[PDB]
Design a protein around this ligand. Structure first.
Ligand SMILES: [Cl-]
Ligand SMILES: [Cl-]
Ligand SMILES: [Cl-]
Ligand SMILES: [Cl-]
Ligand SMILES: [Cl-]
Ligand SMILES: [Cl-]
Ligand SMILES: [Cl-]
Ligand SMILES: [Cl-]
Ligand SMILES: [Cl-]
Ligand SMILES: [Cl-]
Ligand SMILES: [Cl-]
Ligand SMILES: [Cl-]
Ligand SMILES: [Cl-]
Ligand SMILES: [Cl-]
Ligand SMILES: [Cl-]
Ligand SMILES: [Cl-]
Ligand SMILES: [Cl-]
Ligand SMILES: [Cl-]
Ligand SMILES: [Cl-]
Ligand SMILES: [Cl-]
Ligand SMILES: [Cl-]
Ligand SMILES: [Cl-]
Ligand SMILES: [Cl-]
Ligand SMILES: [Cl-]
Ligand SMILES: [Cl-]
Ligand SMILES: [Cl-]
Ligand code: NA
Lengths: 321, 320, 321, 321
């Protein structure tokens, strides 16, 4: 149930904040050039191309109730993203896995936002031969779980708008399956949502089709069928878990081109991302979605998603010692 | 004169190199939270939104022969970029000017690449009211002049391609008049150019029109008339200087939609940006541009652009 | 003041409507291969490439109160469209205008919809040399004045929507300054407007900018300044007349890129085309434009536009004997 | 065996030519308002919206060696196209099939190009209720088989270019799965190919991906795998047959987004459409495709495609009495 899941998070959260006075990693821990530092003290070289030209890729696994969730899927996506950008994970994947879990155990964080960043390094791409672009930089940090939609808002649903002043960066400019931090369009959508009195922007592809929002995939529900865009979006691990939950309940999920018009004619809407999970949308463009309540299929997806966090096929326990 | 301008630069480079053993700022100086540090030692907070989400704007003025070139145009464009992104220059504009001048003077660099970065700060835009987004961060650094085209290549021109695996980010996603560091498409084009045996990628808008390249504007020349794209590109200060020079010489500049086909049927091609100046392109898609030599109008713009660096209306001397 | 012009047309309508029994051309007259036939009896070859592949351009001048309005501008734009499409007006422009006034004369129509069509001919472009594509076909007809907005609606303003299920054909696909009959996107927009309970669709370029609608240009007014898109649209003769009226009245004109958001924050909206003239819009997306009344700048352009039809510099009288 | 197919076609061509003196339908037959006329005498009303605004859909089945090829697949696609455009086939599809067979038998054409056109009718969409737009018009005609690539050129393959002055109309403007005659972009591409010394234009989607050409789908072959675009194109019946032949031969076909770069790195290229069949491309942008010869996998698809014309699951024999 939703109340039991959030009550456990609130308990573990309070325990974490009580440890902050004696554990300098309780607010987060970062890995910078082989050194573990408190997150809010972490610094990176100004000349790092991940800053100078956002020449990087990244990925965000999570920890819930002391259990890493689908970590191997995120590490595999990071490696695929690195290869698409001609980057290379600077450490063996097995060592990265050991460092990540050790950082979580040192922080004591039971519900964690985990981020890995692989940047081009100190040498820019311009005027460089491929041989001198191999010293890629790696940054990792753990921090308390981040909510794109706060737990209280998940009980009643959120408000969204179809963005009309900004469209998603097309794949011909930037591959949206390569997770990146070049959030120019998404930051614009967030400003438009604030100007229009809503919280979440839904960005189109400029061809009257839905893509994704500012840090989440979009799923529409109409007549017992789930619809989510197949192109122009990140292939989210949460979205993959949504498909797993729907298949277990005999619910069809159509991963295809989704017209904007369907968002106005569907029964339920919810957002999905690692930093938040399953987040219902009960208002669109100032009007309620159907009856303005969290739909029944959304709760089924919501309940199943968090149940997967204790399935040993998708999670493993962390030894905090 | 190309040889005269470059010979002066190489001579000043020897002076800078000889000073490096006793000046820790000779390789660059950075301004971080009110502190001046050697550029290669400068560090920024990991949680800065300029890194966490590239939530920033920036601008790049330059120094040549100890003269700041068109600094007030770059400072004004940075302020216009900040307002468009709901950022604000964290220091008064005049105070920023004196810091940059003092930074250049401390470094001893006579030909300088100067960069100013304004990021959102330590708090992200997501789930935030406008009041908690006013603590923007400022980063500035001086570094030796950066060449998108090396001086020796400018004498003969470079090789370019029309990018076919990537197109420019449309203005409906990111305003290209707001200078930003989200170079996803530009970095892809640089890889495609390397894959195809050329140096400079020319990105289209996907609608079969030219836009800009990986850090430079594009100007085509046909029958004595300059053509440069009017939308989907940065309004470069170098491009504005090109128009200034062509204005003084009676050369018509057409800032309009430029179709891709014109790049294959023009007489001269050259790029322009602060990090390099006027850079001729004598080869396109593996084929020569006209006669494969640097064109006469390009040389006219070239000579006029560098003479502008000693015009008091566009520059001022730095007291080292 | 609308009444004088409308009553003139309404009274001239009765003279034409009462002459329907006697006049075989009161409902229209067409020019097909050198012969003149009643409009609703005209026929074209099935193999004409103007039908087989919409391989044509066209233009619509008009007659008002027995005065051809800016006919030479429409003829020049037609010749420009032909050259851009590698077509050629199959008769000297001088013979075309003489044939045109003769057709209006025999029809007796005082307020007429005139349409010229130049098609590729009977031979298709596919697998053909340039020399085999020179026999272009010409089709011309006169028709009673067509209103994209009824005169009664023009006094109160109409309802419009920003199309969300369709966007305008980009110039890189089809040159919108070459007037064509490939209305696939405009027809979809008209269906969307009917679906959403409005009359007129406003199509975007997919990049959150305004373009044009189904057969008209769009003009926005805010703080006494006219705004109309500068690309991706037809350079309409009515729009050029709107700008001309603005020149004579000291109005600032901004022919530039108009973002979609300006339509939701402007003071007045009106559309313009030869088939209807100046056509106000007082409702957008189900909400009133400003105060929902025909704004003062629109009424100013409206009165000036129809006064040009009696200006000898822009019109000339037809001799009906 | 390309000779076996082409020689049989030439023998039937000689028989049809000798009958042209006595048969007025040997050059084609058209169905216009229930009347059968010689194709080159067929006329349509000028005011038909299929001409006035290209407000129509169409489809092209074919006859080979006296056998209709996949006719019901074309009729089903025609019905799906009509429904998407809010049109309706003006006759029962079984009667339409009976009429088509009767026209082919009456013409004596053994290898035929068959075209069916459904237009909006005489009343335009602009300012109309759904009731007044139900009188759709139907045009059908038979004519000798049309070759987008001549049989002799199919032996050595043709030359193509990636169009750089034009891009395909995006689906947000016009649905490419709805076969239409609004060939504005395709005609421009055909002119660019002629300007650049090539025969066939390959149009991109504007996002550095391949779509289709001027009346054909595009298939790339690399390392034994077939690639063809999954969006922005017509879902061709010939393309469907290509997938059928490749599946019967254990050859993988990937219907997915195809980057432009793959066209410059692949082993074989061929086009496919009803009017011509499998058409190899051995030159791209003035350079040979691999060795410049018709590839082995292309010939395998070529042989299987024509063998399908005698498979009872994809063809049926016409009784010419
Ligand atoms: Cl609490
Ligand atoms: Cl994202
Ligand atoms: Cl986030
Ligand atoms: Cl299905
Ligand atoms: Cl649906
Ligand atoms: Cl376990
Ligand atoms: Cl354990
Ligand atoms: Cl000097
Ligand atoms: Cl003229
Ligand atoms: Cl033909
Ligand atoms: Cl269509
Ligand atoms: Cl849009
Ligand atoms: Cl109309
Ligand atoms: Cl019109
Ligand atoms: Cl009279
Ligand atoms: Cl043979
Ligand atoms: Cl009409
Ligand atoms: Cl027989
Ligand atoms: Cl029926
Ligand atoms: Cl070429
Ligand atoms: Cl699609
Ligand atoms: Cl298919
Ligand atoms: Cl590839
Ligand atoms: Cl069957
Ligand atoms: Cl069958
Ligand atoms: Cl048979
Ligand atoms: Na959008």
């Amino acid at each position: 149930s939703m109340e039991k899941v959030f009550a456990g998070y609130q308990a573990r959260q309070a325990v974490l904040e009580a440890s902050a006075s004696t554990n300098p990693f309780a607010k987060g821990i970062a890995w910078v050039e082989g050194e573990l530092v408190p997150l809010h003290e972490a610094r990176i070289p100004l000349l790092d191309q991940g800053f100078m030209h956002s020449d990087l890729t990244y990925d965000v696994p999570s920890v819930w109730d002391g259990r890493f969730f689908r970590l191997d899927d995120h590490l595999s996506r990071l490696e695929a993203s690195c290869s698409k950008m001609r980057l290379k994970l600077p450490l063996p994947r097995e060592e990265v896995k050991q460092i990540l879990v050790d950082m979580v155990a040192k922080s004591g964080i039971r519900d964690a936002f985990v981020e890995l960043i692989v940047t081009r390094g100190l040498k820019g791409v311009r005027g460089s031969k491929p041989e001198e672009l191999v010293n890629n930089n790696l940054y990792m940090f753990i921090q308390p779980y981040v909510w794109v939609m706060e737990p209280e808002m998940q009980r009643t649903g959120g408000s969204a708008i179809i963005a009309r002043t900004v469209r998603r960066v097309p794949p011909g400019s930037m591959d949206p399956t390569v997770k990146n931090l070049q959030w120019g369009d998404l930051t614009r959508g967030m400003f438009e949502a604030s100007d229009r009195g809503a919280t979440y922007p839904f960005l189109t592809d400029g061809d009257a089709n839905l893509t994704e929002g500012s840090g989440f995939n979009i799923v529409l529900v109409k007549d017992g069928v789930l619809y989510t865009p197949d192109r122009g979006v990140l292939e989210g691990v949460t979205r993959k878990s949504v498909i797993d939950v729907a298949r277990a309940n005999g619910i069809e999920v159509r991963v295809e081109v989704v017209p904007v018009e369907l968002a106005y004619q569907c029964d339920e809407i919810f957002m999905c991302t690692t930093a938040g999970g399953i987040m219902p949308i009960t208002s669109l463009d100032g009007k309620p979605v159907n009856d303005g309540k969290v739909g029944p299929i959304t709760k089924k997806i919501w309940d199943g998603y968090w149940a997967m966090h204790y399935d040993p096929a998708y999670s493993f326990e962390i030894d905090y010692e």
